[PDB]
């Protein structure tokens, strides 16, 4: 019928066929995809971006490096990598809330945010956050007052971004470990604000 989907074998069968077609020709090194799977699951992680935020919150000199040469700051920690070679950190302020998207696909600072979540790659987010970020954030559980400008960064080239969120009050004197725990993946993407227990 009109506008019907094309016939397709099960996606798992098609993905593994792609693998076997290449692997059987000797074109895929031993353990090559298993190795990437492990990198993607274990190494690329928003815990790294949380470490960077907590360091910036407690070290003015690192904060300044992260905001002026994010690549350099990240390299100090050894966290450069694929889709994370040219890093720019964008600073939230009392009058500015930053949010990151890839409207054309899914582009994300993989090594310090982790691979993007399903929702970030959704057509709903890709279409809507550029045009109505306040309503999207609100729907997602984050209210941004009218006194704050919202700035959406569309990741359309090689720059890979992370948000440096505002440090919330009630965290004075906390350790880096304590601060890291309240910086989540969504805070690094920009759709959430770090929360402290009461």
């Amino acid at each position: 019928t009109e506008n019907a989907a094309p016939a397709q074998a099960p996606v798992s069968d098609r993905a593994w066929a792609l693998f076997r077609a290449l692997d059987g020709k000797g074109l895929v090194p031993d353990g090559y995809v298993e190795g990437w799977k492990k990198t993607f699951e274990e190494d690329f992680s928003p815990r790294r971006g949380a470490e960077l935020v907590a360091r910036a919150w407690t070290d003015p000199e690192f904060r300044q490096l992260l905001l002026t040469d994010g690549t350099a700051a990240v390299a100090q920690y050894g966290y450069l990598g694929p889709n994370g070679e040219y890093i720019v950190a964008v600073e939230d302020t009392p009058t500015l809330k930053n949010v990151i998207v890839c409207s054309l696909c899914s582009c994300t600072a993989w090594p310090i945010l982790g691979l993007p979540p399903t929702w970030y790659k959704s057509f709903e987010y890709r279409a809507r956050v550029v045009r109505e970020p306040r309503k999207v954030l609100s729907e997602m559980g984050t209210e941004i007052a009218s006194d704050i400008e919202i700035r959406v960064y569309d990741t359309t080239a090689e720059t890979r971004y992370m948000v440096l969120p505002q440090r919330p009050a009630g965290t004075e004197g906390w350790s880096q470990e304590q601060l890291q725990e309240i910086v989540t993946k969504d805070c690094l993407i920009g759709v959430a604000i770090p929360q402290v227990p009461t």
Binding site: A5, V28, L104, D154, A157
Partner: protein, 212 residues
């Protein structure tokens, strides 16, 4: 390419399927889902058969309805498979034989791409620029919402990269250009029909011109 993948600003979608900090489950939600990225890297770094930009473009070349009903990671399975057939590494027949059934691919390209522009300008932070009012049928890393619109430079990258409109087609004339963080007021892009403040697009030098 003015394909359905250029979604920013489309109206009619519903709620984003997420609440902040909700559980997003494991990195991969099926045992095959690591294969499209891993095999993309195999193609780029081990085979040298294509560029990352060619992967973005072959996904843009999915038949439009096919794109719209296909989950993200499956689009990259289809894309990488398509490039392997186009580059002569695999055949569709062996893919369908192995898969036990149909394996439709992206559509052939209808553009040969274009070279890195011969004439561009090095812009400075604070300068006003216009996005070139150009229509590119092949790959381009300019979302249509900003075509022809004016914004201000907040950053010029200190690194340079091959022009997507060339390297996305495997051309030898992609050269290298820096990109620019261009800040647009929301009202510049969507008039009164936005609730935002500003949008920053990371635009190759060859997409820009002085705003006068």
């Amino acid at each position: 390419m003015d394909g359905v993948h250029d979604l920013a600003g489309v109206q009619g979608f519903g709620k984003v399927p997420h609440t902040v900090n909700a559980d997003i489950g494991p990195t991969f939600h099926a045992e095959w889902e690591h294969l499209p990225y891993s095999l993309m890297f195999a193609g780029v770094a081990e085979l040298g058969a294509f560029s990352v930009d060619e992967v973005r473009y072959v996904v843009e070349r999915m038949e439009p309805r096919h794109y719209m009903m296909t989950p993200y990671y499956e689009r990259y399975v289809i894309g990488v498979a398509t490039l392997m057939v186009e580059k002569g590494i695999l055949t569709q027949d062996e893919l369908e034989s192995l898969a036990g059934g149909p394996f439709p691919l992206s559509r052939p390209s209808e553009s040969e791409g274009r070279p890195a522009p011969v004439e561009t300008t090095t812009f400075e932070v604070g300068q006003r620029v216009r996005v070139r009012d150009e229509y590119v049928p092949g790959h381009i890393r300019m979302p249509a919402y900003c075509r022809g619109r004016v914004g201000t430079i907040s950053h010029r990258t200190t690194e340079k990269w091959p022009f997507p409109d060339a390297i996305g087609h495997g051309r030898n004339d992609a050269g290298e250009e820096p990109t620019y963080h261009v800040k647009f007021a929301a009202e510049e892009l969507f008039g009164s029909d936005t609730d935002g403040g500003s949008v920053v697009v990371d635009l190759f030098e060859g997409y820009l011109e002085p705003a006068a």
